[PDB]
RNA sequence: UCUGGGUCGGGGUUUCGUACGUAGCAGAGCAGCUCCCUCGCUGCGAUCUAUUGAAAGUCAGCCCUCGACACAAGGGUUUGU
RNA sequence: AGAUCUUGGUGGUAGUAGCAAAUAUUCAAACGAGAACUUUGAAGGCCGAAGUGGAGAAGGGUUCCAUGUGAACAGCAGUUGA
């Protein structure tokens, strides 16, 4: 429904910004059931929440 | 195990973005 | 009409026929083709035409 | 519109028996088809359709 | 129908087209359009522009 | 039939000509939806996310001149809706736009 | 309607100026290999040459199609001496 | 009946001026009776470390967190909110 709390908790646990927080757009009702950081950790372990990779900024041109 | 029906739909779930984005690793349910 | 501007015979020598959809520079299709000769599309069309 | 080249036959002018370039306008005129006749009658109130 | 003139590019200039340019030295040039005139004024050699007739005959194209 | 699907190519450059820089891509999307409504006669038109990515590939103002799309009219009988048909528009990645015709594509 | 009008596509015109890739004993030169080569071969290398007046756009308010595609005798509101 | 009278209310103006400083949003889905504005995912952008970032002092005082509502406010809306 509205996953602002879930995004904030995921960014807190994952130690990354909200930019890198990826929630599964399919299992919205499953993620919305998460209201504790333990539940967020369990969801991260189960693969519903994934830390997105850092945006690529290569230095090959510089080198 | 993997068969043709399972593979053709697996390609969908592992792709969570366009070219240049990381692939999905797992989606495991456990109660 | 009595002024010498009027009652004056008009004898044409040339009429421009260049393309007004830009700075045209050729009068007729044949003149343009003769000045330019065959082109790449004409070459491939002749290849398809044996 | 386009332009033409003609020779001028205007005595006493600088361009007499010379070549000039004058813009012209093309007006396509397919033949008209007359399909009716109206007769007007003069009145002190002016012309009116009879 | 008048005298046909040749431009920077070597193209024929029909009457009523382009521009004529007379330099102080006593030489007269005529240009088919503003592109040829601008190319000439920058002292660009016509033999180095691929679509000029002089380049065509220099490279024996066609 | 009424569950027909077809492939088209669209002169986006013809329909964007004159649109300001910051509105060119949204205007292209609006023209795409309007063209789908014109061709399939369906008020309900959905644009696939891949097509949306393809149109926005070159940014907001440098919209690609031509694009190849596939129109698929499908039944909307999944819920009580005023319109029983909807048009799905997907992107067709093509190598070139030469001698491409509107062709009927089967299932 | 002897159909129509569209959308693509084609051609015409026009603009810019010769695309990528390939090939070159072209190329300032440089770096490797010598049973080799007897003067060679293998890279790096801007640029040039041929393909190539090429490539690309071209009505959206450019011209002509009779090529393909689908749609068009449908909707609604009023109007009487 | 007045005193540019006092207090309270109501007009025309008028559905008018206007809601234009700081480049820009688009697609799909979910909830919901209701989606331009909520949320998620994708894309394109911007702030470009003297930041639209991360933390404090003064000052505010519960605006903090969670849950619920859609009466009033957030000069449009809102399923959102200081
Ligand atoms: Mg003109
Ligand atoms: Mg065309
Ligand atoms: Mg009183
Ligand atoms: Mg009194
Ligand atoms: Mg008073
Ligand atoms: Mg107003
Ligand atoms: Mg205004
Ligand atoms: Mg920036
Ligand atoms: Mg800060
Ligand atoms: Mg709060
Ligand atoms: Mg309001």
Curated annotation (Swiss-Prot), chain A:
It is found in: Cytoplasm. Citrullinated by PADI4. It comes from the Eukaryota. The modification Citrulline is found at residues 4, 15, 37. The modification Phosphoserine is found at residue 12. Component of the large ribosomal subunit. Component of the large ribosomal subunit. The ribosome is a large ribonucleoprotein complex responsible for the synthesis of proteins in the cell. Belongs to the eukaryotic ribosomal protein eL19 family. This is Large ribosomal subunit protein eL19.
Swiss-Prot record, chain B:
Signal peptide: none annotated. It comes from the Eukaryota. It is found in: Cytoplasm; Nucleus. The modification N6-methyllysine is found at residue 6. When associated with NACA, prevents inappropriate targeting of non-secretory polypeptides to the endoplasmic reticulum (ER). Binds to nascent polypeptide chains as they emerge from the ribosome and blocks their interaction with the signal recognition particle (SRP), which normally targets nascent secretory peptides to the ER. BTF3 is also a general transcription factor that can form a stable complex with RNA polymerase II. Required for the initiation of transcription. Belongs to the NAC-beta family. Part of the nascent polypeptide-associated complex (NAC), which is a heterodimer of NACA and BTF3 (via NAC-A/B domains). NAC associates with ribosomes through the BTF3/NACB subunit. Both subunits can contact nascent polypeptide chains. This is Transcription factor BTF3. It comes from Homo sapiens.
Swiss-Prot record, chain D:
Disulfide bonds: none annotated. It is not required for incorporation of RPL3 into ribosomes. It comes from the Eukaryota. It is found in: Nucleus, Nucleolus; Cytoplasm. Signal peptide: none annotated. Component of the large ribosomal subunit. Interacts with DHX33. Component of the large ribosomal subunit. The ribosome is a large ribonucleoprotein complex responsible for the synthesis of proteins in the cell. Belongs to the universal ribosomal protein uL3 family. This is Large ribosomal subunit protein uL3. It comes from Homo sapiens. The chain holds residues 53 to 102 of 403 of the full protein.
Swiss-Prot record, chain F:
GO terms for biological process: cytoplasmic translation; translation. Component of the large ribosomal subunit. The ribosome is a large ribonucleoprotein complex responsible for the synthesis of proteins in the cell. Belongs to the eukaryotic ribosomal protein eL31 family. GO terms for molecular function: RNA binding; structural constituent of ribosome. The modification Phosphoserine is found at residue 81. This is Large ribosomal subunit protein eL31. PANTHER family: 60S RIBOSOMAL PROTEIN L31. It comes from Homo sapiens. Signal peptide: none annotated. It holds the Pfam family Ribosomal_L31e.
């Amino acid at each position: 429904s509205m996953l602002r709390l879930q995004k904030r908790l995921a960014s807190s646990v994952l130690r990354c910004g909200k930019k890198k927080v990826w929630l599964d757009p399919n299992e919205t009702n499953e993620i919305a059931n998460a209201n504790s950081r333990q539940q967020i950790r369990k969801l991260i372990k189960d693969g519903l929440i994934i830390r997105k990779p850092v945006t690529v900024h290569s230095r090959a041109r510089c080198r | 195990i993997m068969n043709q029906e399972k593979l053709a739909k697996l390609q969908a779930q592992v792709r969570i973005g366009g070219k240049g984005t990381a692939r999905r690793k797992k989606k495991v349910v456990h109660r | 009409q009595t002024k010498r501007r009027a009652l004056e015979k008009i004898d044409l020598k040339f009429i421009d026929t260049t393309s007004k959809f830009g700075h045209g520079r050729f009068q007729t299709m044949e003149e343009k083709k003769a000045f330019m000769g065959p082109l790449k599309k004409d070459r491939i069309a002749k290849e398809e035409g044996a | 519109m386009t332009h033409i080249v003609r020779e001028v036959d205007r005595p006493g002018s600088k361009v007499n028996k010379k070549e000039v370039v004058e813009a012209v306008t093309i007006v396509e005129t397919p033949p008209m088809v007359v399909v009716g006749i109206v007769g007007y009658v003069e009145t002190p109130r002016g012309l009116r359709t009879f | 129908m008048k005298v046909e003139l040749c431009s920077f590019s070597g193209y024929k200039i029909y009457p009523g087209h382009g521009r004529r340019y007379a330099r102080t030295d006593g030489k007269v040039f005529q240009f088919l359009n503003a592109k040829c005139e601008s190319a000439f004024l920058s002292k660009r050699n016509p033999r180095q522009i691929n679509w000029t007739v002089l380049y065509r005959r220099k490279h024996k194209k066609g | 039939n009424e569950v027909v699907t077809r492939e088209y190519t669209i002169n986006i450059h013809k329909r964007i000509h004159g649109v300001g820089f910051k509105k060119r891509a949204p205007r292209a999307l609006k023209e795409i939806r309007k063209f789908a409504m014109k061709e399939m006669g369906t008020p309900d038109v959905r644009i696939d996310t891949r097509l949306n990515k393809a149109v926005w590939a070159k940014g907001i103002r440098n919209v690609p001149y031509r694009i190849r799309v596939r129109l698929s009219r499908k039944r909307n009988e999944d819920e009580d809706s005023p319109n029983k048909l909807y048009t799905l528009v997907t992107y067709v990645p093509v190598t070139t736009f030469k001698n491409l015709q509107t062709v009927n594509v089967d299932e």
